[PDB]
Design a protein around this ligand. Structure first.
Ligand SMILES: CC[C@H](C)[C@H](NC(=O)[C@@]1(C)CCCN1C)C(=O)N(C)[C@H](C[C@@H](OC(C)=O)c1nc(C(=O)N[C@@H](Cc2ccc(N)cc2)C[C@H](C)C(=O)O)cs1)C(C)C
Ligand SMILES: Nc1nc2c(ncn2[C@@H]2O[C@H](COP(=O)(O)OP(=O)(O)OP(=O)(O)O)[C@@H](O)[C@H]2O)c(=O)[nH]1
Ligand SMILES: Nc1nc2c(ncn2[C@@H]2O[C@H](COP(=O)(O)OP(=O)(O)O)[C@@H](O)[C@H]2O)c(=O)[nH]1
Ligand SMILES: [Ca+2]
Ligand SMILES: [Ca+2]
Ligand SMILES: [Mg+2]
Ligand SMILES: [Mg+2]
Ligand SMILES: [Mg+2]
Lengths: 427, 440
């Protein structure tokens, strides 16, 4: 445990993956060239978790950029920070995955996958002690969906002893109009259940509704949604990047958050919710907000379920007494929403460095049984098409069988049944 | 990369190609000699118009097109016309004797003699592509070349290219401009043979286009010229996604993903708005909401059928010009709350939207008014099967008395090919009925 290898696949993966490096680069005082220009040495104490230090004391992100089309990666290379990334670490195709999981996993992705793994291997070599892997991707497309999950499976074969963690973007009919998305998403969940240690369920429905109802953006863009995603990614990784006691590594996080191996889908939360365009928040406000439904990055009502485990990260200069007071107040005021059979399931961290333009923030990470709502949604949409076998030719024309679909459908339905099991479980 | 080869078969197919290519030139700034001053990449580039136009060292932008007819007179007009310098002589293929409105002659008799020459020239064009996407086949249902030769070419293209995309723009027969009494036989024969060999087919009811020209453009007795000018616009809207680039531009393949639920259900309904005269457009601009609503008006459809008496399986909106997401989103939201669109229970009710900023261009000396914005809707409705039924009823009336069948039998065909074609049409009509039933 020390170094994290980051992989970003497909359009969504590369867009959110790019925004991630831009945000934490500024946080750790690294300019678009890779040169350090910060005020604190707290910025470099754990820099090697995400960055490789190179000759002439220049910091290179330990990032692999994957896609089955050049498009997005070209705009990432043309972008502000595209210069920070190692150019040998840009692995792309020309075909595209055409929003088809079968193309990303079996046909087109199959052709590119070993070139990615050679870059994964090279990065893994330059590691004194590799922790595991981080992947950004959407579950609704073809590349990040199909290729991303095949890359996880292949990485797991070569590194079975390491931690596999993902930032998976869930589809919403409010953001996308690609009919096949529920199919790709169910095929991807089946993979995530088996092969990941931790998954941050980033839901496009919740990101859209936050932008519309709370940020009062009439016509939200992808960059608006990605702004909330980059804030969430910066917050959920804090403990890994800065000196600290709680969840300072991927494994310690998993042991605190995962009571049952399939139940590793986290509902991230964030306070204050902001749009890209003064008024500081009190420790009590940060606490009410981070636990509020309106601040969740997954379109689930936490009050409809029970928390199995919670991680709370507070960023900035505040009272550790008051943080502790408010955290205990939240648990003691709503004790029914926290399983009694997992004693002291809420663990809190406080980090002195806040994000850009915020005096203070709070990031929540919850393993709530209410995540079954997101899975019931994708399941409702999948079953509606699959019971009439609609749009399957796109998949069977790639060599897949109805069996894979029936299996994926079953595993996700079983996962929803498991989350219910522990919601109705008493001590 | 992502080049498309266009194949213009028979008179309908050729004359529509003339109109389409004439219009693409106008949209990209390509002169009748093939020169494009706007293009700085001489000899070649990776530009979006390069999916449809190849580039010579000299600076000539050459259509990735083959024009085929079993007779010289229609293609001869292309060879002599304004755009004679646009095409290489080898792209314009003629026979000496046509198929005489007989499927059997175009497929077998006459067609067998020219097929390999056509394939060679397609191969020559294919060889200049860095990454061939597929084909666009323009033909009529009624003519002997349009029906039989297209069938034969489609079958041969499946053998020669595998499952590389094959799209069609098929002219559906209408009495007002109908050339032969045997058009219903030729239509059913080509539909059967081509069904397995096409990935997506855009039918154009000549009656529907006739009515639009008469009603919207106030033209007494519309000519093929008037018709082809309106088809040019619908075709351009569907190919704009491929010939231009933009942030809001959605590729034709992404629309197809949503439009084809089952391989045989690959006939989308095209609706174009606005179709207005210069007189009627003076001091009246139509908004994003206005043009969007006009798509759900049966008067603007490319095929005469009632989608209000059918069920939707998809809706795609392809916008052109001065259109921003805010307005498209609001217009869609309105139509949705207005609850005028009934969908099959098995599929998502979303509307897939594309937008190209380049506005619709007009051919000089046209009937069509130049508008700031236009929209083409591609929907998959069970209503398109009405077209199948009308054509299938006409076929039935004649084949009961075996009327004109000897003309086909004398050319090598069997009665068995007729009955088998018709049974496929009954099966397709049944398939369209089945998809419309709510799940249990
Ligand atoms: C006319 C159709 C519009 C575009 C589209 N509408 C729809 O999909 C609707 C609402 C219509 C029918 C039902 N359906 C769900 C839409 O609003 N979306 C798909 C948006 C996304 C769209 O929004 C707009 C207003 O353009 C886009 N946003 C961007 C964007 O943020 N671009 C940024 C760069 C980028 C590009 C691609 C990716 N994947 C990520 C980022 C650049 C801009 C300046 C920024 O930073 O915001 C591009 S398209 C999502 C969030 C609901
Ligand atoms: N819209 C339109 N329809 C056309 C045009 N030319 C012919 N048609 C229609 O196509 C059908 C007749 O087919 P043709 O294109 O003339 O036939 P062909 O492919 O040349 O076949 P043969 O001449 O028999 O070898 C009728 O339905 C006509 O109305 C045209 O320019 N535009
Ligand atoms: N939040 C967010 N969602 C995106 C973005 N890009 C794509 N998506 C979503 O991802 C899905 C399509 O997957 P995409 O990543 O484009 O395809 P891929 O390239 O084949 O992996 C849909 O649900 C989109 O709405 C992005 O930048 N941000
Ligand atoms: Ca290949
Ligand atoms: Ca060029
Ligand atoms: Mg994509
Ligand atoms: Mg709440
Ligand atoms: Mg002719």
């Amino acid at each position: 445990m020390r170094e994290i290898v980051h992989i970003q696949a497909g359009q969504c993966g590369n867009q959110i993956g790019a925004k991630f490096w831009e945000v934490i680069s500024d946080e750790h005082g690294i300019d678009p060239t890779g040169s350090y220009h910060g005020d604190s040495d707290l910025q470099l104490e754990r820099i090697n978790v995400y960055y490789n230090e190179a000759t002439g004391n220049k910091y290179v992100p330990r990032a692999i950029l994957v896609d089955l089309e050049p498009g997005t990666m070209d705009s990432v290379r043309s972008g502000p920070f595209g210069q920070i990334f190692r150019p040998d670490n840009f692995v792309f195709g020309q075909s595209g995955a055409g929003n088809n999981w079968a193309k990303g996993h079996y046909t087109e992705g199959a052709e590119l996958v070993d070139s990615v793994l050679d870059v994964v291997r090279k990065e893994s070599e330059s590691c004194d002690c590799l922790q595991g892997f981080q992947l950004t991707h959407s579950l609704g497309g073809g590349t990040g969906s199909g290729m991303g999950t095949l890359l996880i499976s292949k990485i797991r074969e070569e590194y079975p002893d390491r931690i596999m963690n993902t930032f998976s973007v869930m589809p919403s009919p409010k953001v996308s109009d690609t009919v096949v998305e529920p199919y790709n998403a169910t095929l991807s969940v089946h993979q995530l259940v088996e092969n990941t240690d931790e998954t941050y369920s980033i839901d496009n429905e919740a990101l859209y509704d936050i932008c519309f109802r709370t940020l009062k953006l009439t016509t939200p863009t992808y960059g608006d949604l990605n702004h909330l995603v980059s804030a969430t990614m910066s917050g959920v990784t804090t403990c890994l990047r800065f000196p600290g006691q709680l969840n300072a590594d991927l494994r310690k996080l998993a042991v605190n958050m995962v009571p049952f191996p399939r139940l590793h889908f986290f509902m991230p939360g964030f306070a204050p919710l902001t749009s890209r365009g003064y008024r500081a928040l009190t420790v009590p406000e940060l606490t009410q907000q981070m636990f509020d439904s309106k601040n969740m990055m997954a379109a689930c009502d936490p009050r409809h379920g029970r928390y199995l485990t919670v991680a709370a990260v507070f960023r900035g200069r505040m009272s550790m007494k008051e943080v502790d007071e408010q955290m205990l107040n939240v648990q003691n005021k709503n004790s029914s929403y926290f399983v009694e059979w997992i004693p002291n399931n809420v663990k809190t961290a406080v980090c002195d460095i806040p994000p850009r333009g915020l005096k203070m923030s709070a990031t929540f990470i919850g393993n709530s049984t209410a995540i079954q709502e997101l899975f019931k949604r994708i399941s409702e949409q999948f079953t509606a098409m699959f019971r009439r076998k609609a749009f399957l030719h796109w998949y069977t024309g790639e060599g897949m069988d109805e069996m894979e679909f029936t299996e994926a459908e079953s595993n996700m339905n079983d996962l929803v049944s498991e989350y219910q099991q522990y919601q109705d479980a008493t001590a | 990369m992502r080049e498309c080869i266009s194949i213009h078969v028979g008179q309908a197919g050729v004359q529509i190609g003339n109109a389409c290519w004439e219009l693409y030139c106008l949209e990209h700034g390509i002169q009748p000699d093939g020169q494009m001053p706007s293009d700085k990449t001489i000899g070649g580039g990776d530009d979006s118009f390069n999916t449809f136009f190849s580039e010579t060292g000299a600076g000539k932008h050459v259509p990735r097109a083959v024009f085929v007819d079993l007779e010289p007179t229609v293609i001869d007009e292309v060879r002599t016309g304004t755009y004679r310098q646009l095409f290489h002589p080898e792209q314009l293929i003629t026979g000496k004797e046509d198929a005489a409105n007989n499927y059997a002659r175009g497929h077998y008799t006459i067609g067998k003699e020219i097929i390999d020459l056509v394939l060679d020239r397609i191969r020559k064009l294919a060889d200049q592509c860095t990454g061939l996407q597929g084909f666009l086949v323009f033909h009529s249902f009624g003519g002997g070349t349009g029906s039989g030769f297209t069938s034969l070419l489609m079958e041969r293209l499946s053998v020669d290219y595998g499952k590389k995309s094959k799209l069609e723009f098929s002219i559906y027969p209408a009495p007002q401009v109908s050339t032969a009494v045997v058009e219903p036989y030729n239509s059913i024969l080509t539909t059967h043979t081509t069904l397995e060999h096409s990935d997506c087919a855009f039918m154009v009811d000549n009656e529907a286009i006739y009515d639009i020209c008469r009603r919207n453009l106030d033209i007494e007795r519309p000519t093929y010229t008037n018709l082809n000018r309106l088809i040019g616009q619908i075709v351009s809207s569907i190919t704009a996604s491929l010939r231009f680039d933009g942030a809001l531009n959605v590729d034709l393949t992404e629309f197809q993903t949503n439009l084809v639920p089952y391989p045989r259900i690959h006939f989308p309904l095209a609706t174009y708005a606005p179709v207005i005269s210069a007189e009627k457009a003076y001091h009246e601009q139509l908004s994003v909401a206005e043009i969007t609503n006009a798509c759900f008006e049966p008067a603007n459809q490319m095929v005469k059928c009632d989608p209000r008496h059918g069920k939707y399986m998809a809706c795609c909106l392809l916008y052109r010009g001065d259109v921003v997401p805010k307005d498209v989103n609001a217009a869609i939201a309105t139509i949705k709350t207005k609850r005028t669109i009934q969908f099959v229970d098995w599929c998502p009710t979303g509307f897939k939207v594309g937008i190209n900023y380049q506005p619709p261009t007009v051919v000089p000396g046209g009937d069509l008014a130049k508008v700031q914005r236009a929209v083409c809707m591609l929907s998959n409705t069970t209503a398109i099967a009405e077209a199948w039924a009308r054509l299938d009823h006409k076929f039935d009336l004649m084949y009961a008395k075996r009327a004109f069948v000897h003309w086909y039998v004398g050319e090598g065909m069997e009665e068995g090919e007729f009955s088998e074609a018709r049974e496929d049409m009954a099966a397709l009509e049944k398939d369209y009925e089945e998809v419309g039933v709510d799940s249990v």
